[model samples]
Target: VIREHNKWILKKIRFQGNLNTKKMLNPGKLSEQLDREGRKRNIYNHQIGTIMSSAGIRLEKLPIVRAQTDTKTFHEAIRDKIDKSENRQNPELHNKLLEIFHTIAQPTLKHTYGEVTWEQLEAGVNRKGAAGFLEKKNIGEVLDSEKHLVEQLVRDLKAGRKIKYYETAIPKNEKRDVSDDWQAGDLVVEKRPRVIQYPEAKTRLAITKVMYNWVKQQPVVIPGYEGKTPLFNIFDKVRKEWDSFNEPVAVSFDTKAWDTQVTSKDLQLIGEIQKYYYKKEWHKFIDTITDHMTEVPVITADGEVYIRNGQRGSGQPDTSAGNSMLNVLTMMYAFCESTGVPYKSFNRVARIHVCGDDGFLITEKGLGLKFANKGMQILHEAGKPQKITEGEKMKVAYRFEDIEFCSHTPVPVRWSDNTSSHMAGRDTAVILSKMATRLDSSGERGTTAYEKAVAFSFLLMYSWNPLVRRICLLVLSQQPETDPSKHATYYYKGDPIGAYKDVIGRNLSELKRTGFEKLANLNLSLSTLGVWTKHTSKRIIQDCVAIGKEEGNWLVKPDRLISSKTGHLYIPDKGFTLQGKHYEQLQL
Candidate 1:
């Protein structure tokens, strides 16, 4: 059979080109059509070029300062300031100096709150308020005079910085007894269900043979019955005994003397027979077992079960094993139905290679030759196994590919890796969309559901807003502090807010330029797609507008609404619906 099938497959491959000739075989024509389509759409082309023209000669004239002279002058001044320690020991005088430092540092403070320098502190002192100690003094001259004093102040502040603390606690003991001894009469005791054990190996073998004989006689293929004794003989022997109401007797095959090579085949056949009988008996037992089992009682304030006389057992019966049995039987039934062969007349034509919880697998190529002709004849005669449904197709696909005996073999079949021919992503996305629709239609919304949606959206945008935000924060935190004199010279104490604002605001603005705008646009497009109807869009927009209005009202103060609390200049709730809420004064 294997040789015959291989010959047929090889023959088909030889004439594969001829088969292609009979179908749509041209690729050049497809490419021409695609080219025509591209031409219909207007597309822009871009070019790279230099920024400046080589023909334009340019030069600038400036006086050059000697590097030695500048370096020597600055170094000498810095050294003098570092060496001088005037007004170092007077406590009252030191406090006054610190006050001067604090005032000078105000500009740096406003620029970057909580982060300031000694030079900025000195500059703040020169400003016209609080401490005016350094007013009208040349910065270079002052540094030359009091560099060491400023350095000492900075060192002291660094040394006196606050340390952060964390708090934790240990939980107290609170325990309860969960043993069976503590349970009440009405309290349910859930013990693991016991599995049925077969008799000793020898006796079990005998019983299995008898049962297999009986099963073979039925109108179905007993799996693992092929390549050995013919099944019809066993069926003939069992039918007579079954008809006579006499137990079908066992034909003992000695384990020690039996062919060791055939032991696996015999055991597998026995297991299949047992599986069938076990299912029959299980269903019968379920029908007869009506007694209520023990139940767990819920304790209440009244010292009684939560509900009077309510059984603590689950409403549904234990059907774990039963479900497995039913699945096996259903597959057998589907096989018989498809083949149009009665269980009793199956003989050896139909072969069952493997059986599982959902379905079974037969050697398709082998089965086709063995029983296809007979099965088709039977179906032709009975007018059955025609026009299969979607469900039947699904079952057949599963039976052939997933729930098969051959899969257990090391050399199993696999799907091709050619993604263009077979893309699982498309199907997976479709399945997910269906599942999501079902969940949404069921109205299963909760905090977890909302959180999942939000998390997915955030993940989608993580490469955009969140990524840039993280990068900006990391860069800002790691930025080295500028030299105090340079910082104070460029940024005055009066414009402290401006300094920090410049740093944070500038970086944030850059983030918007990089990818934030694209991310925001993508979010807007996705939100629009999520809306099923115009009504939904309207409600969403209305809710967003309301939220914006509320936030806008909280952001401004009356009369000075042009300035927000953080002091950046802006129109007073121009695009927002801020009712009559007053704006807070800008701190800066």
Candidate 2:
């Protein structure tokens, strides 16, 4: 009763003082002091604050200071004896797995497309890229002088002029403040920025854009598809299949920092697998593609340039081509193990699917643990470089048994009476909750909440997901939207389902704007925008300092681009555009 009656007093007592009483405790003032003191001590912002003000901070200018240093100094050195380790390769390498691997490694020797040609080069040329930016010549300009440019590339390739790519870093700062558990020998480069590769003009035209397509169409390989609609269909079908099983569990595994740690040594297995599965055709050309792609010359935050050898870079155009083949091989290996036959028969019986490094499987109640472990073991054996032989154990994890089902969004897939269903997931609830908390906690209150709400509305409407669409209505509802419940069990007190029903039944035109409809009608791929919203919402809240009230003028304008290098938010200030095949931000 005392606590309930005197909440402000209790807060003051707990914190040692209230904001009004302690002038130094004000967010802006406190953050300013932290910034200045941080500069002097060479410290980074390491604390969790609902409304921490990064008023004048620049992420690019900051040094990479992460948790590993503190862990080494505080815990590892004092508590335990100095640890030592040794390494050895297994001698019994001639096993069934290896035999199976070799048998299916041959390539399908089919020459559907002959040697590289001029038409393919012209078709592959892109208007905007790092190469185009550096050369100060767009693809159109290059194509205007096509014969000269084509011959120039041919001569360069003949003369053995090595390909060079410029690399830039994009800090994964969105989840920086959230703590996570790491396995032994993890790189702890959570603080490290993800690298994007921009091939030199000739490399982009000859290999990345053109040859990647050519190699992908080979009879030995399946053309990888990344569309969410197809992915959703897969999930819908799997969910339906689980309806008959009594108390089945979903299991999933993820490679820790999967893209960054993929070394050239790891990538080499692709060639071995392809070689034995079918007869060789254009084998040397395929090998050349990977060889040229691996070595990325990184331009660091401090402007120092160096070559990052072995490991694959994140944004290379052909990354999917390489990773997809590996994904396929791993799935095949599992299929063979389960069925005692090496082919694509696992999907027929086992409820399983894989997209990139994330894999999912469903089995009877008690079998999830063993199935998940077996799956991880196969992945570990197949992807040799990701194995933990020498250094700290590899950083990979799997989840099962009453855990959230992951697919970019982590939704609870519950079972009852031998049936399953998916509800509005934690992704949207937590996103809206955090957004509300941040706005209310800040002192400089304006229409920032309304502006952000409208922007989020555009994002969700274009996103076109059933789950996201529900939360979108709740946020834009005209009812007295109370602040989300702070209790752990009830993060969002608002009725998302009711809101969704009301909006559709009443035909609420206020929630739907004309500009948003026009942009939606453009029929552009907004899937990236969906992924971006889930990951970057917190950072967006932090970066968008002021959002003006003119909603329509700013909502539909496609002038703004949110590039990783620039650290810009996809706010009213900017919208995105399709540059080449990738979504790049446009300057307004």
Candidate 3:
């Protein structure tokens, strides 16, 4: 790997366990090249030493930051349900919440006074579903993200391709007793902070995702962002000019503090900018979001009560992401407006890619100073402490502001480094940790290895082919021309599907040494016992089941037990429309 000096280092997820000697050396199945490589890259001869080989990394490893961007809608929905449920089962608690609301309403009354009649106030304030804080209850949407994953699976399975995906069920936003056991890999994996959500958040997210996607897509569709770089755009640009893509720069702007700088008016700015620059009447659309937040209050774990006055403090799951995205766009617009730069021209020239408050932009091979400086200007406008980094072979890294989307890994990392060229960011480690076995300090078994297999299979099942193909090339030494490699369109460009391992020989060898031999059996199990998984919402897999179509029946896993995989009862299934009940039973 090319050594590059960098100041920003974040924590990473780690592989903490060891391999099952017999299982790893699964007979009659090991690929010949894989066996040859095992001998060639021998550390202990049989056991793979680390996720990334010890000597290969050379530099001290850092704990990885996971930017899952999860639970925005789901957890917000769950939290809403919890609040209402809490208020319902306990009447006094419910009344206490009402008292807080009345306090929030006082300011409203002060502003309205005799100008508005009491009838309208009573109808809105005290009636059923009329509380100012509540909006169209549940958005009735939560399965799309899962559906997106499943759609890929159906395609691969129809192609007779093997896959593995190892996520615990994407938990519903509503509360239920969770009685799940530790899969082998999960015991050592870091647990993301738990969040509960309300259905409304999910609904809001579904709708907002559409609008946000539309907004983001306009540049591509309207030819506005044709040359500019965003997420996939950076990858494509970097790929086209990899040999000369220097100063692979990243900008750091803390999200928590930025949230403070963004107020409700900032959200409206996005609307006004769209209306003015794009010449669309979009100014008032953001108010629907603000109206949903009108007077919403939160009580602390300690009985302290206060109303959130700023843009919002991460509680409104559906609204927060859209709010943050709008705020960031607003900053870009302001930069454009102040400088009299055409917004469309800025979109074309800007190398920025933002998600909420934290994101980075890379300078193209030829165009450097302008985009780089423009990025800093936007960073300054956002009021975040701006630290700019420039180097070759830099990492595309990130950390969530206040959200915990997935398990966090523990690794030694710092804000500055002088010796190492490229540090293994935690996101890299976290993604690989799912496919690894953990060990205590003594290299003893820290967890059963079934999960390593399960997790890989889950990735396969979900059809994350680019990622799956990378693992194939890395761990199993699979040929690039094979069926698995065919799906890796994003391999060399456009997100590149975790190709950092390809650059770091140690990381690839580490995976190969760890458990490359199990490759054949993992597929065999999927072929024999069919799909094995715990509970997924029925909404996730209905379309993929091929109901009354060809192939065979796709069934849902009835329980959370690993041993129950072979015992799953295959059944006739329909997609969507299950568990669709909104948590609106607890009303004002």
Alpha-carbon TM-score of each model against the true structure: 0.19, 0.49, 0.35
RMSD of 1: 42.2
lDDT of 1 by residue, 1-588 (tens): 245555544432211131225445422111011223464211100000000001110000001011222333333422332122111121232233223223222232122112224433333222211111112333334445645544443333234322111111111111112122222232222222211111122211212222322322222232322212221122222223223422211111111111111112222222333333343433222122211111112221122222112111111112212222222333333345555545443333333322212223332333332333343333223212223335323222211112212111111111123111100111111111221221111122222332222222221122123321221121212212321111111221212222323322221112222223333332342222221232432333332233234333311111111222223322221111110111111112
**Which residue runs of candidate 1 sit more than 4 Å off their true CA positions?**
1-364, 368-429, 440-444, 448-588
Candidate 1 global lDDT: 0.23
Q: lDDT scores for all predictions?
A: 0.23, 0.37, 0.29
What's the candidate order when arranged by decreasing TM-score? Answer: 2, 3, 1
Better of 2 and 3 by TM-score: 2
User: Model 3, range 24-128, lDDT digits (tens) per residue?
Assistant: 431221111133235422111112223123223211111222222255543443344223210112223223322322322223222211111222222211112
**Residue-wise lDDT of candidate 2 within 1-588, one digit each (tens)?**
344575554433211121355434332112222422354221212221211213212221111223332333323321221121111223332243344444443344333333456554444244544433245554556556553765555445535455444554322223232112221233244343233445545455555333433334334243222322222224335556565466666655455445644555446655444334322444554565556645655553335455655455555555555555555445555545533543444444445544455555555544544444455555555442233434233222232212333334223332223333333222332232233233221112223234234324333222333223322332333233333222111122233222222322211111322223322322122221121233333443323322212332222111122122233322222122111221211111
Q: Give candidate 3's error at residue 254 in angstroms.
A: 5.0
RMSD of each: 42.2, 14.6, 22.2
Task: State residue 295's C-alpha deviation in candidate 3, in Å.
Answer: 5.7
